Structure 1
Amino acid sequence: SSKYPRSVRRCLPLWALTLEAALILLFYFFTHYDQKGLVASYQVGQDLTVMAALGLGFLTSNFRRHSWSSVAFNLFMLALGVQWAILLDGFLSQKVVITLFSIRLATMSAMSVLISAGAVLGKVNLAQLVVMVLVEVTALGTLRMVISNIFNTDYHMNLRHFYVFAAYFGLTVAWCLPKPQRATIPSLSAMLGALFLWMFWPSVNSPLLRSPIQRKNAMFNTYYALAVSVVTAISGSSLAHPQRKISMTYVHSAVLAGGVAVGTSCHLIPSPWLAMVLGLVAGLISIGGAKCLPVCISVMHSIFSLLGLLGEITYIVLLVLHGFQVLLSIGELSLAIVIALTSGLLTGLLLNLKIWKAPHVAKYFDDQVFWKFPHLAVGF
């Protein structure tokens, strides 16, 4: 097989333009438009957009020669995912009325895919990412619809499982990919992205809560848990390292451990000390996973999945205080995990198709595959 990348001058433009034309046609046929707090409602969605673009594009840009692709592909995936998620959430919760709240929900749905893509960035091209975006948005919408139909929950309120869904979907897709690093300036850019994610994660911890009191309590808990998690992660990076130094890449992923741990139950926490305890437990679990998971591909995605599972478990624990309820919650969690694994397997099987012109395994984590650089021999 030729290690030189195949020409995508006819596959990628045709695919992207066809997707955009289909999106425009569907918006024309199925979408319709529509006060005092318009700016206040827009600010939450703006924070979600800022996270999804900046933090999730630069957080994976820590690679030595794959930061361009990480950032630009994250932007492209967000732009496609919001547009497709608007239509999918309109279809599965019913025409589609487009509001700021629907834009916020589609932004969360795209954030799920952006989190999943971190396990597969550096090993796929743009068309495979488009396929992953479409399939993952459809699978998350189907999971939310099934949960709403079975457990009598709300379709928009089933978006709380997006941490665990994104993590397991990303791991499952990365498992199916063919088997195959850092620099200072890309690490600083990833630190900027991680800082933005850490600062604005309280917004993503309460976009679905309606009452102001629950949102305020959730933001308090997320803020304190995130502070505790940052302290614990920066402290314990030296413990879980053979060189006895602090790993910047580990910090980039473990800054968010407390926010992930308290994400599903930030409104149920009645006092900030419990949130701080949860953040400390999240940080210690992150240290343990960083020290143990590589022994038994993406370590950060694996510890993110472990943190999401821990957050679900502590939600189960906290829900009892505030038999059949535990069974319903565990069944919902198991259904989410099974659907995420099945959809990840399907997406990985579709991503191995030869028609996508995937990069060679020896050309992984390189921007030279997808980007033009001067003084290069082109073609044969």
Structure 2
Amino acid sequence: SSKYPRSVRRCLPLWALTLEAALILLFYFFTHYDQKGLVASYQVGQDLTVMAALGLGFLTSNFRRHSWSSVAFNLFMLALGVQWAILLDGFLSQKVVITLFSIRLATMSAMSVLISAGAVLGKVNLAQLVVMVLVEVTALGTLRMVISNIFNTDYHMNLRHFYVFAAYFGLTVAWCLPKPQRATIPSLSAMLGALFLWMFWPSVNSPLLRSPIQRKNAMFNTYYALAVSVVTAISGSSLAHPQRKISMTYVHSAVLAGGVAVGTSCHLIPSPWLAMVLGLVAGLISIGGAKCLPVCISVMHSIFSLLGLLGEITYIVLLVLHGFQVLLSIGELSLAIVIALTSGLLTGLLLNLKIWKAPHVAKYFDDQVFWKFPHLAVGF
């Protein structure tokens, strides 16, 4: 088939405008409005927004000729995902009352999709990413509602599983795609994104904590675990590389190792030494995954999935201290992984449809497929 991209002049605008019109109509029909800590509560959601846009958009900008698409497509996906998540958490957890807390939770739902998209960025166009956003937000909401119905937990509190759900969903969608690199300046921009993610990840580890002391302890644990993980990741990178040099690409994701490791249990860790130990173990596991997983597509997504699983395991280990609860939590994790993989299969089969006008496999990771550039021959 032709390696020259098909015109999306009718598909993409119609798709995006119809989506926006439908969202506006649903907001009109189903959403409704409504102090001292107004700015303080706004800042947590703002920090999540800063992470979702800047850190996640630039973290994947490391590709040589795909930085524009990474950043701008992440922005588009965030804008769509927050609106759709507001509507979906409204529908599955009751009209929809819009508060800053609801915007914060919808932002978390959007960041789940934004994390998943890193495994597929450079291999899809904007319409495929729209489909991925819609289906993944719906699947995450369905998983949370199922957990709320079965295990009698709160719908909003079930959003803790979003690391492991995002990792396995992204891996599955990437596995379904057809089968197919760095530059210095995009690497520095990706480092900017990784630094913002690393700096504000304590805001990821406590949006859903109502109590102040729980937020305090979780934030402290995330901060110290992230510091330890940064040191371990930078130092051990030379071991897990053929040329014995530090890999910037490895550092960009392995900095977040401790934050993911303590993500679901930072509120239950009682002393900073335990969080520091967990950050160290996360860094060592990151070294091992970098050195061993490529032997057995995105390796960084693979070690992210392993680290999310490890965070769930350490939550299981800690939850006993603070065996039927073990069985219930293992069933919860297994259900989360099963739903993530199944919805990832469905999303990948939907993405493989011809009508999406997906880029040719010879044109992966290239901004010229989607973006205007000067002095190019256009059309036939």
TM-score class normalised by the smaller sequence: over 0.9
Per the TM alignment, residue 54 of structure 1 is displaced from its structure 2 partner at its CA by 0.1
Instruction: Measure, in 2, the Cα distance between the counterparts of 1:373 and 1:125.
Output: 17
Match of 1:201 in 2: 201
1:22-44 Cα deviation digits (max 9, x unpaired): 00000000000010000000000
Instruction: Measure, in 2, the Cα distance between the counterparts of 1:283 and 1:134.
Output: 33
Instruction: Measure, in 1, the Cα distance between the counterparts of 2:203 and 2:363.
Output: 38
Match of 1:46 in 2: 46
Question: Please, what is the CA RMSD of the aligned residues?
Answer: 0.2
Instruction: Measure, in 2, the Cα distance between the counterparts of 1:34 and 1:86.
Output: 14
Per the TM alignment, residue 73 of structure 1 is displaced from its structure 2 partner at its CA by 0.1
Per the TM alignment, residue 150 of structure 1 is displaced from its structure 2 partner at its CA by 0.1
Per the TM alignment, residue 4 of structure 1 is displaced from its structure 2 partner at its CA by 0.1
1:252-275 Cα deviation digits (max 9, x unpaired): 010000000000000000000000
1:289-315 Cα deviation digits (max 9, x unpaired): 000000000001000000000000000
Per the TM alignment, residue 95 of structure 1 is displaced from its structure 2 partner at its CA by 0.4
Match of 1:129 in 2: 129
Per the TM alignment, residue 120 of structure 1 is displaced from its structure 2 partner at its CA by 0.1
Instruction: Measure, in 1, the Cα distance between the counterparts of 2:327 and 2:275.
Output: 25
Per the TM alignment, residue 232 of structure 1 is displaced from its structure 2 partner at its CA by 0.1
1:335-377 Cα deviation digits (max 9, x unpaired): 0000000000000000000000000000000000000000000
Does residue 338 (structure 1) correspond to residue 335 (structure 2)? The answer is no
1:55-103 Cα deviation digits (max 9, x unpaired): 0000000000000000000000000000000000000001000000000
Per the TM alignment, residue 228 of structure 1 is displaced from its structure 2 partner at its CA by 0.2
Instruction: Measure, in 2, the Cα distance between the counterparts of 1:247 and 1:354.
Output: 37
Per the TM alignment, residue 214 of structure 1 is displaced from its structure 2 partner at its CA by 0.1
**What is the correspondence of 1:6-155 to structure 2 with a 5 Å cutoff?**
6-155=6-155
Q: What secondary structure, in the 3-state scheme, does the structure 2 residue paired with 1:368 have? A: helix
The share of aligned pairs that are identical, in percent, is 100
Instruction: Measure, in 1, the Cα distance between the counterparts of 2:292 and 2:205.
Output: 28
Instruction: Measure, in 2, the Cα distance between the counterparts of 1:67 and 1:295.
Output: 28
Per the TM alignment, residue 14 of structure 1 is displaced from its structure 2 partner at its CA by 0.1
Instruction: Measure, in 2, the Cα distance between the counterparts of 1:70 and 1:240.
Output: 27
Instruction: Measure, in 1, the Cα distance between the counterparts of 2:109 and 2:185.
Output: 30
Instruction: Measure, in 2, the Cα distance between the counterparts of 1:244 and 1:300.
Output: 18
1:224-261 Cα deviation digits (max 9, x unpaired): 00000000000000000110000000000100000000
Q: What secondary structure, in the 3-state scheme, does the structure 2 residue paired with 1:132 have? A: helix
Instruction: Measure, in 2, the Cα distance between the counterparts of 1:241 and 1:64.
Output: 20
Instruction: Measure, in 2, the Cα distance between the counterparts of 1:363 and 1:332.
Output: 40
Per the TM alignment, residue 288 of structure 1 is displaced from its structure 2 partner at its CA by 0.0
Instruction: Measure, in 2, the Cα distance between the counterparts of 1:203 and 1:58.
Output: 19
1:148-191 Cα deviation digits (max 9, x unpaired): 00000000000000000000000000000000000000000000
Match of 1:327 in 2: 327
1:116-150 Cα deviation digits (max 9, x unpaired): 00000000000000000000000000000000000
Instruction: Measure, in 1, the Cα distance between the counterparts of 2:300 and 2:25.
Output: 39
Instruction: Measure, in 2, the Cα distance between the counterparts of 1:313 and 1:287.
Output: 19
Unaligned runs of 5+ in 2: none
Per the TM alignment, residue 320 of structure 1 is displaced from its structure 2 partner at its CA by 0.3
Instruction: Measure, in 2, the Cα distance between the counterparts of 1:164 and 1:269.
Output: 20
Instruction: Measure, in 2, the Cα distance between the counterparts of 1:242 and 1:73.
Output: 33
Per the TM alignment, residue 110 of structure 1 is displaced from its structure 2 partner at its CA by 0.1
Q: What secondary structure, in the 3-state scheme, does the structure 2 residue paired with 1:328 have? A: helix
Alignment coverage as a number of residue pairs: 380
Q: What secondary structure, in the 3-state scheme, does the structure 1 residue paired with 2:181 have? A: coil
Q: What secondary structure, in the 3-state scheme, does the structure 1 residue paired with 2:368 have? A: coil
Instruction: Measure, in 1, the Cα distance between the counterparts of 2:213 and 2:230.
Output: 26
Runs of 4+ in 1 over 6 A off after TM superposition: none
Q: What secondary structure, in the 3-state scheme, does the structure 1 residue paired with 2:185 have? A: helix
Instruction: Measure, in 2, the Cα distance between the counterparts of 1:9 and 1:271.
Output: 57
Q: What secondary structure, in the 3-state scheme, does the structure 2 residue paired with 1:69 have? A: helix
Instruction: Measure, in 2, the Cα distance between the counterparts of 1:204 and 1:40.
Output: 15
Normalising by structure 2, we get a TM-score of 1.00
Per the TM alignment, residue 207 of structure 1 is displaced from its structure 2 partner at its CA by 0.2
Instruction: Measure, in 1, the Cα distance between the counterparts of 2:203 and 2:124.
Output: 30
Unaligned runs of 5+ in 1: none
